[PDB]
Design a protein around this ligand. Structure first.
Ligand SMILES: C[S@@+](CC[C@H](N)C(=O)[O-])C[C@H]1O[C@@H](n2cnc3c(N)ncnc32)[C@H](O)[C@@H]1O
Ligand SMILES: [Ca+2]
Ligand SMILES: [Ca+2]
Ligand SMILES: [Ca+2]
Lengths: 1011, 146, 143
DNA sequence: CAGCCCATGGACCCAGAACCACCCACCC
DNA sequence: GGTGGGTGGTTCTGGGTCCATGGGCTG
DNA sequence: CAGCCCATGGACCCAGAACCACCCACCC
DNA sequence: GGTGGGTGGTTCTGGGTCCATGGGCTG
């Protein structure tokens, strides 16, 4: 520190005042003591006159050397006399071979650092600032050896499958034994009451692999072999491993795994700081699952939390412990649990935070840990004990970690009687801080994956009685593992506690989490949210604002560090991180910032318990509802009718778009044919195969199929079911509209009967509108992904054995007619007028948050006929995008590069792409393929935007050569070539170009007056 | 004095644990520190290696030279590597032309204080209480005028 | 025969262990040796990266160029990285004007032989007896 | 109660692009 | 002698989807 | 036989001794 | 500005003892 620099300057004058000596033998003693006191802080020590060898060999003698604990030099020092010039003698000493890696050439007047033969800092001495800078840089230089431990970490991160194959082969060939087969069926039984109630023989094989793999690395890379001989869990498992890992077999496997473990153990031996070796502990923790069992990596959500977030989350809880309660982390009674410990970074950084006096009492019985998987548990325990050795002194077994399912520990942890009673003492403790990082998993990829987060009966029961109870959300996503951990944390916490978790930022603002907030403010006295954004399941302008991910761009969900204190009305404090920041900036503001120095802005919850997105009320929002909650649910009793349209619908959902959304008529029939057949094969498959999904995933089986499959309800093709369907904006596709395949129809056969019917619908968007609110009047069967949250308001709702019953309810007609004193306004008139107002830009501009949360209340604007006629031109030119006469574009062809058929075929590939300028501006040119370029698109045609993508861009993206995400369709049914849809794409573009310009014209005639 | 001597010990093991050498040049950093720190509070200062003259010679060079605020030498220290037998390194030293007015002859685990013409008491450096008593006298020795 | 074929595999396995790199730059050395030896043993050679010129006038560079005594070309070898669908990189190479007479488009896992313009054979390069078959055919394809 | 509607937000990854090193043909 | 061009490797950086699955309700 | 006599080669240290490295006090 | 003494590491290298302990006499 600069304090030490000042002390050295006081010793420099003392030597030339008491001794009055100007000899090198006496003017250097000051710097000797200075480096010595700085070094003892870093972890090295300065040893004088170490005779070293030079490049020539001549024994040289740098006056000092920064020796390590493995006696390796991290640097050197050559003090010369105050008088002699340094730059000349630097170049004369260096000639004899003096070191150049990290030498501080000093002369009791000027200190220079030549690092890598390179002068970096020539700080003239006698400095109250940059001299401290110099010594910091010197004592923090990276040894050439640490950058190789980094290189070897990455290689192992990529030759892990090859190494794991060896261990996999071993465990299969051990199943030939009757000692393995007998003991691996008793492991399963003891582990069908402790960690996994569905412990499979293949889960026991996974544990065996992890135990052995980490055993070889713990004894070499980390030198701690005694860990496995002491850890209760290891012993219960060697009982199962030394059944096959013995004598010859043991030697064979070990010598076959050497061409992978070798290098890591030849660079991990030349570094001697555990904090650097922790980078491999993390790497192994994650990579193993991604190279072996990604199914586990999903539900467990194995991930590492960057140190910056952890350290912030520790200092912030310490600076809140005296604020609302009255204590300090290093007090007595601050029992800090941490469910979900993973690599242990939440208790290793706590050890480093705690002072080196009370640490003993805290390490012994106040720091607690909880884990479910084996690899994380082992890594965490070893890490904590090694951090204790680096901080306090003599290794002392951490005896507070456990292997229990936290959400189920409410005979848990019975794998070892030790961990059982360890989790019993944990349960009995009065815990006060609950810090940690929960899994944010919620739902599986596709239902052919077969991976649901274990239903925690006890824990989800209180969620149902608390978070879910208040939330009236039609869909319920409050059963997320993050919210389950929150429930467990609030119930462990007795009184005066600080739950600090980092999780998905959906809790702050989601229709689903509207009631979570309501209940959470009752169980707490102060809430301190810190939105770190970084959401990536969004597109367009939104993905820009969110920016980089505070989890090293490894996840796509939003992240928010929240601290809910309970001093036992609340005060919701909030600080959104500046938008458009990248990840490395976000994780720097989280190291260089103190919690008490951020400026939180009091949020006062609204009636709907919405924290963000607070609707403004000064606006004239309340007008004429298009559909109301009770217009769709009216019991067909004319009277409660309270809006314009009555029964509205939603975009068709299928769940098997790989076997339902195609271009050609028979192309779909073929994908569906194989299905209608393989479902019928899965049907003849046993009742057990139907009950526990023991069949094949060649075809997309969603819940409906899995169920009519259990009832053995064979299917059969009805060619009538296939119907033209507008998949995306201006993209007419085909679709098997049947009850067999499509998961939810949403009263679509009541709006568009039997796929083919004649009602004209207006597609709208939903709420909250993630993508900008959009409007598409369509006459073709729609899709849920056509517009953002597609919700279709129809015009002539049909009935069963019935007919076009006008939809605009009669109440709406009367109100409109009487208001404009017309008594002649028709249903079409209203329809068209509504479309014009919806399209009106200033309408959705004034009502921004009003529209993204409830149904767009259409205002009664001064003239009716004017807007009715506006929305008439709009309607027609958007219901007939394939008749609108084209706009004259220009095809400028060219020849292929060479004459090889290979080049010609590669020049027929859909390189469909917009041609943006050096300033991201479309030039009005679309490169169709490598032989044709269409140009002349007007710039006003790029303006019309249905979502986050212009109408023209939609057509290109919906005709690009994409590879199906299914394998059975990437091999037998991928037949779409840009060659098939060549001139049809050009034809579509020409007509859509005209449509785009026309829309802008009509929408421009509309003013800025907003009723 | 007692806590200070109990830290000279720590930084002795540290020279060998970090460096890995027992050559005199490197193991002398611990005793240097101890002496200088003790002298600071008392008022004096150990200025290391101040070439001191001799009765018979061109010049000699002690490795420690307590020099007071008025540049006057009142005590010295000559280190020793473990290899040499300290006693015979003493006669070798006090023959070339080394001072005897006040000098600490220390090896690494045993130390004598030849003070003003005669040895006082020989103490081992492993014992904190012993080295304390002796260094006190190296620092509480004052000339006759005082 | 099969001995030299097995030797190639051994060499490649040492490259991905003593260096750890599975990049072709280092892996090719193994196949370079195998092709050069079977050749000398059947009256030929494997001169490496000899720039050929295409009909369109592109100076192409195959990784190999089995040439014979009067300095004429008889075959051409081209090895792609073990980290790409081979049947995709074959097209890219041929679309620069790559020779189609007798070319071994080979990735570390599969070896495809083209002659005139048709895939004559594709073998798992791991099976010793199978490669031994394909390699012999390439060295015996006479104009 | 049991099928049948109605939600609603979801722990990354991989193609280009820039660019770099090395050597070869080809202007110089 | 440079230099642009073939071959190959190494970092960045930009940028975004259909569909699972519990509640609420007819019936 | 016990208790005197007669052999007969022995699994290394080390004290200088150069000799150099650094560097301060003295001749240049 | 050299330039040797003077302290310290460093690595060669030349050179050389008293005395155990079985067997054969041996009284
Ligand atoms: C994000 S990781 C832990 C994070 C940790 N701070 C780190 O940096 O590695 C989530 C971990 O929670 C553990 N875990 C413990 N109890 C769990 C439970 N009941 N449900 C899910 N995961 C649990 C899993 O084994 C998994 O390794
Ligand atoms: Ca020096
Ligand atoms: Ca000395
Ligand atoms: Ca190649």
């Amino acid at each position: 520190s600069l304090q030490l620099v000042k002390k050295f300057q006081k010793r420099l004058e003392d030597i030339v005042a008491y001794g009055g000596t100007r000899n090198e033998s006496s003017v250097r003693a000051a710097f000797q003591q200075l480096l010595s006191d700085w070094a003892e802080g870093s972890g090295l020590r300065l040893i004088t006159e170490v005779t070293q060898k030079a490049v020539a060999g001549n024994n040289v003698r740098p006056d000092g050397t920064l020796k390590d604990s493995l006696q390796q030099s991290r640097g050197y020092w050559e003090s010369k006399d105050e008088a002699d010039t340094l730059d000349d003698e630097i170049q004369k000493k260096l000639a004899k071979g003096y070191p150049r890696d990290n030498i501080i050439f000093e002369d009791s007047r000027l200190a220079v650092l030549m690092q890598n033969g390179e002068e970096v800092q020539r700080v003239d001495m006698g400095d109250a600032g940059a001299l401290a800078g110099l010594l910091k840089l010197f004592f923090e230089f990276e040894p050439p050896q640490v950058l190789e431990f980094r290189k070897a970490v990455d290689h192992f991160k990529d030759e892990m499958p090859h190494l794991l194959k060896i261990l996999r082969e071993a465990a299969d060939a051990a199943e030939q034994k009757a000692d393995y087969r007998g003991e691996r069926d008793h492991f399963v039984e003891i582990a069908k009451e402790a960690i996994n109630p569905d412990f499979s023989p293949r889960d026991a094989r996974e544990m065996l692999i992890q135990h052995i793999l980490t055993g070889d690395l713990f004894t070499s890379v980390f030198d701690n072999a005694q860990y496995h001989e002491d850890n209760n869990i290891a012993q219960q498992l060697q009982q199962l491993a030394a059944t096959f890992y013995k004598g010859p077999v043991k030697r064979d496997i070990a010598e076959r795994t050497k061409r992978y473990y070798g290098a890591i153990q030849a660079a991990a031996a030349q570094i001697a700081d555990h904090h650097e070796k922790q980078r491999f502990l993390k790497a192994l923790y994650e990579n193993f699952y991604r190279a072996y069992n990604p199914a586990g990596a999903e539900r467990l959500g194995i991930f590492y939390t960057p140190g910056e977030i952890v350290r912030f989350m520790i200092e912030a809880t310490d600076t809140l412990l005296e604020k609302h309660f009255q204590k300090e982390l290093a007090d007595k009674g601050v029992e800090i649990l941490d469910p979900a410990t993973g690599t242990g970074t939440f208790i290793t950084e706590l050890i480093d935070f705690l002072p080196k006096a009370k640490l003993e009492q805290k390490y012994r019985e106040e720091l607690h840990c909880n884990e479910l998987a084996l690899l994380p548990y082992y890594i965490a325990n070893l890490n904590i004990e090694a951090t204790y050795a680096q901080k306090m002194g003599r290794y002392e077994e951490f005896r507070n970690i456990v292997l229990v399912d936290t959400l189920d520990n409410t005979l848990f942890g019975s794998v070892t009687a030790e961990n059982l009673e360890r989790a019993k003492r944990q349960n009995a403790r009065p815990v006060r801080v609950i810090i940690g990082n929960p899994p944010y998993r919620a739902n599986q990829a596709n239902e052919n994956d077969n991976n649901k987060n274990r239903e925690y009966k006890e824990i989800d029961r209180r969620i149902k009685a608390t978070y879910v109870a208040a939330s009236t959300a039609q869909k319920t996503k409050l059963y997320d593992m993050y919210s389950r951990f929150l429930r467990w944390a609030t119930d462990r916490l007795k009184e005066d506690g600080i739950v600090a978790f980092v999780s998905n930022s959906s809790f702050i603002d989601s229709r689903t989490f509207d009631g979570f907030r309501k209940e959470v403010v009752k169980d707490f006295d102060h809430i301190y949210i810190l939105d770190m954004k970084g959401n990536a399941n969004t597109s367009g302008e939104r993905r820009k604002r969110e920016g980089g991910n505070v989890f090293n761009d490894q996840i796509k969900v939003g992240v928010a560090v929240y601290f809910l204190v309970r001093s036992a009305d609340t005060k919701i404090w909030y600080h959104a991180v500046p938008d458009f920041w990248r990840a490395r900036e976000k994780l720097e503001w989280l190291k260089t910032t103190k919690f008490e120095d951020i400026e939180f802005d009091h949020i006062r919850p609204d009636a709907k318990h919405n924290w963000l997105g607070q609707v403004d009320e000064e606006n004239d929002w309340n007008e004429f509802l298009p559909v109301a909650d009770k217009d769709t649910k009216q019991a067909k009793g004319l009277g409660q009718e309270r809006a314009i349209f009555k029964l509205y619908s939603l975009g068709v959902v299928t769940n098997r778009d790989e076997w339902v959304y195609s271009r050609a008529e028979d192309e779909l029939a073929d994908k569906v044919r194989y299905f209608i057949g393989r479902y019928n094969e899965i049907i003849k498959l046993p009742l057990g195969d139907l009950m526990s999904r023991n069949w094949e995933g060649d075809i997309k089986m969603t819940r409906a199929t899995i169920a009519d499959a259990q009832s053995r309800k064979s299917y059969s093709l009805e060619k009538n079911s296939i119907v033209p369907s507008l998949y995306r904006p201006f993209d007419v596709l085909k679709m098997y509209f049947s009850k067999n395949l499509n998961e939810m129809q949403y009263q679509m056969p009541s709006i568009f009967p039997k796929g083919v019917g004649e009602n004209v619908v207006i597609a709208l968007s939903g709420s909250p509108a993630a993508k900008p609110f959009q409007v598409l009047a369509t006459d073709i069967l729609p899709s849920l992904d056509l517009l953002e949250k597609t919700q279709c308001l129809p015009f002539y709702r049909y009935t069963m054995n019935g007919e076009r019953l006008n939809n605009i309810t009669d109440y709406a007609l009367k109100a409109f007619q009487t208001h404009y004193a017309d008594t002649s306004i028709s249903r079409e008139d209203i329809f068209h007028y509504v479309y014009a107002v919806l399209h009106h830009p200033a309408y959705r501009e004034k009502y921004a948050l009003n529209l993204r949360q409830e149904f767009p209340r259409i205002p009664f604007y001064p003239e009716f006929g004017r807007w009715a006629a506006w929305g008439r031109e709009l309607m027609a030119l958007h219901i007939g995008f394939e008749s609108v006469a084209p706009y004259p574009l220009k095809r400028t062809d060219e020849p292929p590069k060479n004459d090889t058929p290979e080049a010609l075929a590669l020049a027929k590939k859909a390189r469909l792409k917009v041609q943006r300028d050096a300033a991201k501006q479309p030039t009005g040119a679309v490169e169709l393929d490598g032989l044709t370029t269409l140009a002349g698109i007007p710039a006003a045609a790029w303006a019309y935007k249905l979502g986050n993508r212009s109408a023209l861009e939609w057509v290109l993206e919906r005709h690009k050569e994409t590879t199906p995400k299914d394998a059975t369709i990437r091999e037998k049914f991928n037949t779409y070539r840009f060659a098939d849809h060549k001139e049809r794409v050009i034809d579509l573009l020409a007509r859509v170009t005209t449509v785009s310009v026309e829309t802008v014209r009509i929408v421009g005639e509309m003013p800025a007056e907003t009723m």
